[PDB]
Design a protein around this ligand. Structure first.
Ligand code: DGD
Ligand code: DGD
Ligand code: CLA
Ligand code: CLA
Ligand code: CLA
Ligand code: CLA
Ligand code: CLA
Ligand code: HEC
Ligand code: BCR
Ligand code: BCR
Ligand code: BCR
Ligand code: HTG
Ligand code: CL
Lengths: 81, 451, 342, 137, 34, 334
């Protein structure tokens, strides 16, 4: 053994479950809200179902320049009306 | 806790059911409880199928494997396989479900409440695996039961409404079987057919008279052999050839079941008589022939002479000759010319497909049937997207013939592995070295060197 | 001299549940970041602006179709640093431009270095020979040749493999269609090493388990072994006689046997890596010139070699427009290669 | 892009009257098309006769025209060949032949409109993919 | 007798804490409609 | 000591350099027949009309093949699943044209290899061994049945069995992908885990045992001379190996029981290859890999491509080109 408390000891202790009956659902709910508020879309820049295309276009907004790539994406994002 | 840990029994928990080998009373419970599970599933699955069943859709578009078994026996269906009454499906489900509680009850009682061993309690129900007389007697009882079971199918066919006959004149119908084939040259001649293409061994049975008469022969044979094995004990040649132990007897049955599972795989894949395509969908050969039929019909309506249309390879675009001369469908389906089905046979003459019948006698119901089977070919993805692997999502379909054939190949394969596992272990245990080599008696150390 | 360096060394090498070591300063951040980037990317990040693809659970992909995709072909071989001139510190743009791909590949490369330093470090403390580290050179040769050298020979990172299940399947099929990679003898050697390695794994395990000495009374033979016992737990002599009489030849030296088990899969992976280095430059084993000369002149000459090239030609024409959107391939129906009817 | 009333507006008849479907009608049309039609018509082609597809341009040149709601609803009651010369209820599913095509027995008039609407809207969404076959997959 | 905050404690939570958050995010995604 | 008992004692003798046994009585003639036919056909057989369209494919060395492109070509699609022994042909020239040799080779090989598995059981019994080495061999054996017998049955023709050649194997794999999307089937995925895992654990076990060899030699000699065949004592320190690998990961991720370690080495690749074999066997009945083609749709209903759709494009290219003259009707249903 290496000195740390055995895992079977910990996860059958009431105090472990007093603490983790709160921390585990709290993290789950934070993750749910990260999606349900729509925050995940805006942090990562991921399209919503209604923003892959403009209403009549069928061309991908593909990045084609290396050093103006940032402006190209911003321009593609404007053109969503 | 008799034999319920590794120290007392020698078997770890992951081989825990091996602790039951010499505990006939608990072993009886395990077997009865398990049969309840089988009967439970049959009852429950039928009810699930019925609840999800729409009579206007073909069975094969609905993921049904049990209702097609009931419909084939003549319950609930009329001409063309149309469902006329779903109540028999209901009855079959309910009765199996109710019976499973009886079996579950007895299983749980014998498993945890009743006597662990039966030998002290009753010498009729007691047994020793090494008692060759008692084992063949128990075997004999169960052969008589199986024989009655085969005779119940005959009773349904001859006296209680008949069977669904996909071949019946007028499109398929329930029909009472009045003259079952009894000629043993026919019945046993099926057993000596080659299993290769155009022959098909017993999978090729194609009429209900042979099906019913084969079950008459099987019924008598099982009853006779059952009486034989009650009254006799294994002969000397038999005694020397076998291992006589519980695990050995298990291993023989595992071999037998694996063989039966492989046969059932081919039965559902090729046979359209006892697995009517009305209920199960077309066979793979059937849907491929149906495509050729569909486009022959389309192109002939446009004015093509399909008899003389030369395809790109030089073989007929629509029709060609089999290696033995018969007129057959062309294209890649040349491999399927052994297919026989009621929608196709009216076009068949002595030389195979008959060009005059093709030109003049193709009825609209045949065009309908071929377009239906061509578009319900047994191809589809694991998530039940129907069609070739390159098809787009839209059609939720996998044929029952694919489900039944793949499941039973997998089961038969693992049961062959189980046979090898337990036959090899039974042999080693009988001879006494299934736990390893005795260091002081290592057989190879007493043998001359190879070189 | 017990300065701060030696005190730090003491703490790093404590016998704890997870050993750390000096190597752990490199290993743990880089491994954790590479794994966290893959999970972050496959959960939340799109491939819409680089590939025209959805690629995250957020977009509706499943475990088989999510990926962290390669950057757009227009990025070339850019490091795509978060603070570099393409993303310019903008985390959201960085994600949209494929910055997570180089993030994962580069932290992964340094993570792998760190894992192999860990094998050396622990081996030197415990006192064993470092053959586990040496065997691990083969996974490293594979990773570096496929994920780094191969795209560096090509036009851009875009043609590197993307980090996903179905994306890797696309990579296998691209290599068949464009490189005829099944024909490459360096791949063939790798196949032999992998399949022969699996074979050796199965046969050695089964042979040990079926030549065991009866060292206990239970029907479960696992208990009859003690890690400190001096005796072999199975009979090398009976094993040798069995395979000599079944197969003709057998192992008789147990040290050779286990060196060979190291040698076979490690050598195989190294061979496959060399072939991929050649594919970086399109230096393929694509054709047999003698077959092509004959088939060009003799329209009745047909082999499985010529049949497979027709399949490769189908792959290229039918997948290129979607798989290479920056090229803008417009292939009208009439130019697509197809057999009769299909 | 969104499924808008503009997308859901389709010709009702040959005289140029339009009708605007609801999203619920469109989605019901999709489900019923899958139920009764897609085994042969997945993606707007026709597996048992690939010469005839469900592209609006193809439907416009049918006789009588089928590129509008009334033409399509009539087709599902009494289908004809492309030139209108022959009635093909005996080999194509229809209300007239619901006895031999049992899936048509539980379609109501409202359903035929929704199926028709799906067939006319889908090309406005999918372009060439609708009726184009494997080339556009 | 035992400590609470060890290296193993840190290693466990750097993995387990984001896992639960991600599982909640992915659970929410199953109710997104197009 | 009558002549039958004498013959039985020789057949089952543990003193023959190669064990014969009752399985070997079937094994030896069938494997000899398959081997001799294979060698002759590979060198000298004329072209074979595999797909039944009078378009013969050249498989042998003398007809323009090298080692990589050569094959014994499957029998004709016109034969389908019919039995085609030499005596059903009007002549040897007919039999060769129609791929007769393929049937003779695989039927004798499958019989011989099944008897090879029985022979592994049989010798273990004669030597007092445990009996399950043959269960491990059932994994590669099941696979041979899958590509030579089961897949032909389900598709209805030995012309869709695997060719007996290097490039023929590749052809089989590519067409399999087009028709079943095998890459997306979990049983092939479990098979890849089986052989990638098996290769990994092979190198793992080899490296750990080699790392813990007990010093018994000088540096100028092979450490392999430190082990002597038949010696009673182990040749490496499994405690040192476990002490290294436990710290590499953590202590409870490491084996210290050689028996359960070696059982794991047996089980992992054997189970994985069983699934691979069952993948081929169940895709023989057209239960194909996952189909996510056009699974992701935007708010308007535009298809949003995934990597699955890119795989579909490659599959389509394989589909439309394979057997380019063999299809007259639009669906490749078998
Ligand atoms: C104790 C062991 C002793 C061993 C004995 C060895 C002797 C030879 C073994 C058999 C070899 C079989 C090879 C060909 C199998 C085959 O083509 O099988 C097909 C046949 C069915 O034949 C088909 O049968 C059809 C019958 O249908 C006909 O009749 C029907 C009536 O409805 C329809 O009308 C239909 O349209 C019409 O064509 C046609 O004749 C077809 O042309 C014909 O191909 O199946 C059958 O006979 C029955 C199924 C046989 C089992 C299948 C083999 C599976 C083996 C798996 C092993 C795995 C091992 C793993 C190792 C680890
Ligand atoms: C073993 C164990 C190792 C353990 C892992 C170690 C991990 C370390 C990680 C290091 C990562 C190195 C990143 C290299 C990036 C790169 O290369 O980026 C490539 C750049 C060159 O940029 C490329 O340049 C190309 C050529 O352009 C040139 O030509 C053009 C067209 O005519 C124009 O004229 C243009 O202006 C001109 O620059 C194109 O422009 C490409 O788009 C552009 O990406 O080189 C450069 O940064 C530097 C080039 C010189 C050094 C290269 C040595 C290292 C790589 C060796 C691999 C050999 C591969 C050859 C194929 C085999
Ligand atoms: C069909 C599957 C099946 C069946 C019928 C059995 C049956 C049995 N097992 Mg086995 N076993 C199985 C699967 C099965 N097992 C599996 C998957 C494993 C691996 C985990 C094992 C591992 C194992 C070990 C290690 C042992 C057994 C033992 C036994 C026997 C005694 C069990 C006991 O005393 O528990 C007592 C348990 C209880 C009293 C708790 C509840 C049990 C009841 C039966 C639950 C029934 C619930 C049901 C809904 C009630 C319906 C009532 C209604 C019909 C009226 C019994 C005959 C034991 C044995 O051999 O004894 C000699 C034994 O040691 N089994
Ligand atoms: C009628 C069939 C049958 C019967 C009565 C037996 C009976 C026995 N077997 Mg055998 N066996 C069989 C078929 C059978 N076997 C088959 C088909 C195989 C090939 C796979 C085997 C392979 C086998 C091996 C390798 C061993 C046995 C052993 C045994 C003995 C102990 C069994 C036990 O307690 O397992 C306990 C049950 C479990 C531990 C549960 C297993 C869980 C399975 C793998 C899950 C399967 C997944 C499921 C189908 C789907 C997923 C479910 C999930 C989604 C929830 C017992 C005498 C042992 C023995 O030799 O004793 C003498 C032994 O070592 N069997
Ligand atoms: C003979 C067995 C068998 C067959 C052929 C079928 C066939 C079918 N079922 Mg049924 N069913 C079965 C047994 C079977 N089922 C059992 C045992 C149950 C209770 C769990 C059910 C309960 C059930 C329900 C509730 C439903 C079905 C449905 C269906 C249909 C769709 C199947 C599907 O989409 O699967 C999806 C495919 C899988 C889930 C793949 C399973 C992979 C397994 C886990 C691998 C196991 C391998 C092996 C056994 C383990 C070996 C381990 C090794 C170590 C030895 C199809 C007709 C559906 C339907 O349409 O109803 C009308 C439906 O809703 N079935
Ligand atoms: C094959 C299954 C099977 C077998 C071999 C046995 C055997 C035994 N049982 Mg068990 N048992 C079973 C299933 C079985 N049982 C079931 C399903 C239940 C729940 C109903 C029970 C509930 C049970 C109890 C409560 C007791 C036993 C007892 C016994 C012992 C004495 C029985 C006797 O002498 O009856 C004499 C024979 C008869 C009375 C003839 C009965 C005929 C049946 C009821 C009519 C149907 C016959 C027909 C073949 C059924 C077809 C069923 C098929 C469709 C599935 C004997 C060892 C006794 C015991 O253990 O003593 C300590 C005891 O007290 N059993
Ligand atoms: C579950 C069914 C079953 C089982 C397990 C048994 C078991 C037994 N029977 Mg019984 N028997 C049965 C049903 C059964 N029988 C029936 C229904 C009848 C009436 C027909 C008989 C009539 C009977 C007689 C007359 C005798 C036995 C005997 C025996 C014992 C020796 C078995 C043997 O050596 O076979 C080995 C099989 C052979 C030796 C057959 C020849 C080998 C050929 C070449 C194998 C061919 C395999 C091939 C793959 C076949 C494929 C299908 C084929 C038809 C084309 C054994 C205890 C013997 C005994 O000891 O009686 C007390 C005996 O003399 N049985
Ligand atoms: C296969 C058994 C089919 C089913 C199910 C459905 N259709 Fe069909 N369709 C089929 C064929 C062979 C044809 C050509 C008929 C001919 O000879 O002209 C058609 C044609 C149509 C058309 C006409 C298309 C055109 O371009 O003119 C329409 C509008 C049509 N089919 C619609 C339709 C609907 C709504 C279905 C479900 C109720 C349906 N079809 C099913 C084959 C099959
Ligand atoms: C021994 C043992 C075991 C096993 C057990 C078993 C297996 C048992 C079985 C059991 C069973 C097998 C049971 C059953 C039961 C049943 C029931 C209980 C039923 C009921 C029914 C009902 C109630 C019905 C109803 C209805 C109707 C009538 C109508 C329709 C609708 C409905 C459905 C509602 C185990 C492994 C655990 C372990 C331990 C030992
Ligand atoms: C019902 C029906 C029918 C009929 C059927 C029949 C009549 C059957 C029979 C069957 C049979 C009649 C079978 C048999 C079988 C057998 C077997 C399967 C055997 C086996 C054997 C073995 C296994 C052996 C082994 C061995 C050896 C070889 C050596 C020595 C040792 C030993 C013993 C181990 C028909 C088709 C008409 C129709 C449909 C329905
Ligand atoms: C990128 C980046 C970063 C990082 C991040 C991170 C680090 C993250 C992490 C993350 C994580 C760390 C996550 C995780 C997740 C997890 C998950 C999501 C899981 C899931 C699972 C499952 C789902 C399971 C399943 C299963 C299996 C697998 C088998 C067994 C059974 C079961 C079924 C259970 C930073 C900020 C630095 C910077 C920027 C960039
Ligand atoms: C980079 C690390 C190089 C070690 S540097 C070294 O560290 C010692 C601590 O033991 C000091 O006592 C010493 O003055 C210092 O030069
Ligand atoms: Cl065709």
């Amino acid at each position: 053994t290496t000195g740390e408390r055995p895992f079977s000891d910990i996860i059958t202790s009431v105090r472990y479950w007093v603490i983790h009956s709160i921390t585990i659902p709290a993290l789950f709910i934070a993750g749910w809200l990260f999606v349900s508020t729509g925050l995940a879309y805006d942090v990562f820049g991921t399209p919503r179902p209604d923003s892959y295309y403009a209403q009549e276009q069928r061309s991908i907004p593909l990045v084609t320049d290396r050093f103006e790539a940032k402006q190209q994406v911003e321009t593609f994002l404007e053109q969503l009306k | 806790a008799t034999n319920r840990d590794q120290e007392s029994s020698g078997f770890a928990w992951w081989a825990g059911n091996a602790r039951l080998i010499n505990l006939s009373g608990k072993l009886l419970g395990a077997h009865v409880a398990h049969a309840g599970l089988i009967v439970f599933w049959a009852g429950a699955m039928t009810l699930f199928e019925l609840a999800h069943f729409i009579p206007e859709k073909p069975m094969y578009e609905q993921g049904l494997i049990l209702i097609p078994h009931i419909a084939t026996l003549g319950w609930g269906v009329g001409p063309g396989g149309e469902v006329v009454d779903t109540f028999p499906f209901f009855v079959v489900g309910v009765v199996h479900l109710i019976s499973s509680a009886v079996l579950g009850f007895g299983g749980v009682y014998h498993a945890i409440r009743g006597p662990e061993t039966l030998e002290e309690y009753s010498s009729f129900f007691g047994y020793d695996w090494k008692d060759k007389n008692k084992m063949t007697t128990i075997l004999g009882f169960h052969l008589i039961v199986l024989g009655i079971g085969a005779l119940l199918l005959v009773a349904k066919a001859m006296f209680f409404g008949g069977l669904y006959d996909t071949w019946a004149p007028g499109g398929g119908d329930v029909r009472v079987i009045t003259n079952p084939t009894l000629d043993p040259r026919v019945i046993f001649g099926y057993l000596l057919k080659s299993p290769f293409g155009g022959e098909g061994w017993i999978v090729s049975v194609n009429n209900l008279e042979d099906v019913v008469g084969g079950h008459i022969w099987i019924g008598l044979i099982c009853i006779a052999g059952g009486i034989w094995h009650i009254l006799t004990t294994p002969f000397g040649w038999a005694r020397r050839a076998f291992i006589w132990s519980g695990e050995a007897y298990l291993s023989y049955s595992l071999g037998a079941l694996s063989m039966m599972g492989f046969i059932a795989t081919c039965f559902v894949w090729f046979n359209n008589t006892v697995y009517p395509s009305e209920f199960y969908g077309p066979t793979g050969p059937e849907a491929s022939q149906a495509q050729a039929m569909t486009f022959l019909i389309r192109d002939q309506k446009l004015g093509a002479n399909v008899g003389s249309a030369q395809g790109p390879t030089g073989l007929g675009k629509y029709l060609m000759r089999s290696p033995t001369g018969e007129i057959i469908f062309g294209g890649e389906t040349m491999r399927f010319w052994d297919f026989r089905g009621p929608w196709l046979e009216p076009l068949r003459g002595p030389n195979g497909l008959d060009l005059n019948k093709i030109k003049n006698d193709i009825q609209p119901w045949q065009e309908r049937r071929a377009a239906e089977y061509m578009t319900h070919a047994p191809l589809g993805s694991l998530n039940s997207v129907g069609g070739v692997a390159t098809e787009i999502n839209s059609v939720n379909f996998v044929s029952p013939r694919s489900w039944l054939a793949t499941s039973h190949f997998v089961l038969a394969f693992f049961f062959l592995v189980g046979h090898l596992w337990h036959a090899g272990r039974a042999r080693a245990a009988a001879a006494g070295f299934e736990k390893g080599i005795d260091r002081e008696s290592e057989p190879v150390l007493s043998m001359p060197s190879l070189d | 001299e017990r300065g701060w360096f030696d005190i730090l060394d003491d703490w790093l090498k404590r016998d704890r549940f997870v050993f750390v070591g000096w190597s752990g300063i490199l290993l743990f951040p880089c491994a954790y970041l590479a794994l966290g980037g893959w999970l972050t990317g496959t959960t939340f990040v799109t491939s819409w602006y680089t590939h025209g693809l959805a690629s995250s659970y957020l977009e509706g992909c499943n475990f088989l179709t999510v990926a962290v995709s390669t950057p757009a072909n227009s990025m070339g071989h850019s490091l795509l640093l978060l603070w570099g001139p393409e993303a310019q510190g903008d985390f959201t743009r960085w994600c949209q431009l494929g910055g997570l791909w180089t993030f994962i590949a580069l932290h992964g490369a340094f993570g792998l270095i760190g894992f192999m330093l860990r094998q050396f470090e622990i081996a030197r403390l415990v006192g064993v020979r470092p053959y586990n580290a040496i065997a691990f050179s083969a996974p490293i040769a594979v990773f570096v040749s496929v994920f780094l050298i191969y795209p560096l020979g090509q036009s851009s990172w875009f043609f590197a493999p993307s980090f996903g299940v179905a994306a890797i399947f696309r990579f296998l099929l691209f290599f068949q269609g464009f490189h005829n990679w099944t024909l490459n003898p360096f791949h063939m050697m790798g196949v032999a090493g992998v399949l022969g390695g699996a074979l050796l794994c199965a046969i050695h395990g089964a042979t040990v388990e079926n030549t065991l000495f009866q060292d206990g009374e239970g029907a479960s033979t696992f208990r009859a072994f003690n890690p400190t016992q001096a005796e072999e737990t199975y009979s090398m002599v009976t094993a040798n006689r069995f395979w000599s009489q079944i197969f003709g030849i057998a192992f008789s030296n147990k040290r050779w046997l286990h060196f060979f088990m190291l040698f076979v899969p490690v050598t195989g992976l190294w061979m496959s890596a060399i072939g991929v280095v050649g594919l970086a430059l399109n230096l393929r084993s694509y054709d047999f010139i003698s077959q092509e000369i004959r088939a060009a002149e003799d329209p009745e000459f047909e082999t499985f070699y010529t049949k497979n090239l027709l399949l490769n030609e189908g792959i290229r024409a039918w997948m290129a427009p979607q798989d290479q959107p920056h090229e803008n391939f417009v292939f009208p129906e009439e130019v697509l290669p197809r057999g009769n009817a299909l | 892009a969104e499924l808008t009333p503009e997308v859901l507006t389709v010709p009702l008849n040959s005289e140029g009257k339009t009708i605007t479907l609801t999203e619920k009608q469109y989605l019901e049309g999709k489900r019923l098309f899958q139920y009764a039609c897609a085994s042969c018509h997945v993606g707007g082609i026709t597996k048992t006769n690939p010469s005839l597809d469900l592209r609006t341009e193809t439907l416009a040149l049918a006789t009588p025209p089928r590129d509008n709601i009334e033409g399509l609803v009539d087709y599902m009651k009494n289908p004809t060949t492309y030139d209108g010369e022959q009635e093909i209820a005996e080999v194509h599913p229809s209300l007239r032949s619901a006895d031999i095509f049992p899936k048509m027995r539980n379609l109501t008039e409202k359903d035929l409109v929704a199926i028709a609407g799906h067939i006319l809207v889908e090309p406005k969404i999918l372009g060439d993919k609708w009726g184009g076959g494997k080339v556009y997959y | 007798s035992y400590p609470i905050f060890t290296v193993r404690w840190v290693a466990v939570h750097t993995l387990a804490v984001p896992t639960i958050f991600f599982l909640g995010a992915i659970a929410a995604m199953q109710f997104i409609q197009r | 000591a009558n002549l039958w008992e004498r013959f039985c004692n020789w057949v089952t003798s543990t003193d023959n350099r190669l064990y014969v046994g009752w399985f070997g009585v079937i094994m030896i003639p069938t494997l000899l027949a398959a081997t001799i036919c294979f060698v002759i056909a590979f060198i000298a057989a004329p072209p074979v009309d595999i797909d039944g369209i009078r378009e013969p494919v050249s498989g042998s060395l003398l007809y323009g093949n090298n080692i990589i492109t050569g094959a014994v070509v499957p029998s004709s699609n016109a034969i389908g699943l019919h039995f085609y022994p030499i005596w059903e042909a009007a002549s040897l020239d007919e039999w060769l044209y129609n791929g007769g040799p393929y049937q003779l080779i695989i039927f004798h090989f499958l019989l011989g290899a099944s008897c090879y598995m029985g022979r592994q059981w049989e010798l273990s019994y004669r030597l007092g061994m445990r009996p399950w080495i043959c269960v491990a061999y059932s994994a590669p054996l099941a696979s041979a049945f899958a590509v030579f017998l089961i897949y032909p049955i389900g598709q209805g023709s030995f012309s869709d069995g695997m060719p007996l050649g290097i490039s023929g194997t590749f052809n089989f794999m590519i067409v399999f992908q087009a028709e079943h999307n095998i890459l997306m089937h979990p049983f092939h995925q479990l098979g890849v885990a089986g052989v990638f895992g098996g290769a990994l654990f092979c190198a793992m076990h080899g490296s750990l045992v080699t790392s813990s060899l007990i010093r018994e030699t000088t540096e100028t000699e092979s450490a392999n001379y430190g082990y002597k065949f038949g010696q009673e004592e182990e040749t490496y320190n499994i405690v040192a190996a476990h002490g290294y690998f436990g710290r590499l990961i953590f202590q409870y991720a490491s084996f210290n029981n050689s028996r359960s370690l070696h059982f794991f080495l047996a089980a992992w690749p054997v189970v994985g290859v069983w699934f691979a074999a069952l993948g081929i066997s169940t895709m023989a009945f057209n239960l194909n890999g996952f189909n996510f083609n056009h699974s992701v749709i935007d708010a308007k209903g535009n298809v949003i491509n995934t990597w699955a759709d890119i795989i579909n494009r490659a599959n389509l290219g394989m589909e439309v080109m394979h057997e380019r003259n063999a299809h007259n009707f639009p669906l490749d249903l078998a």
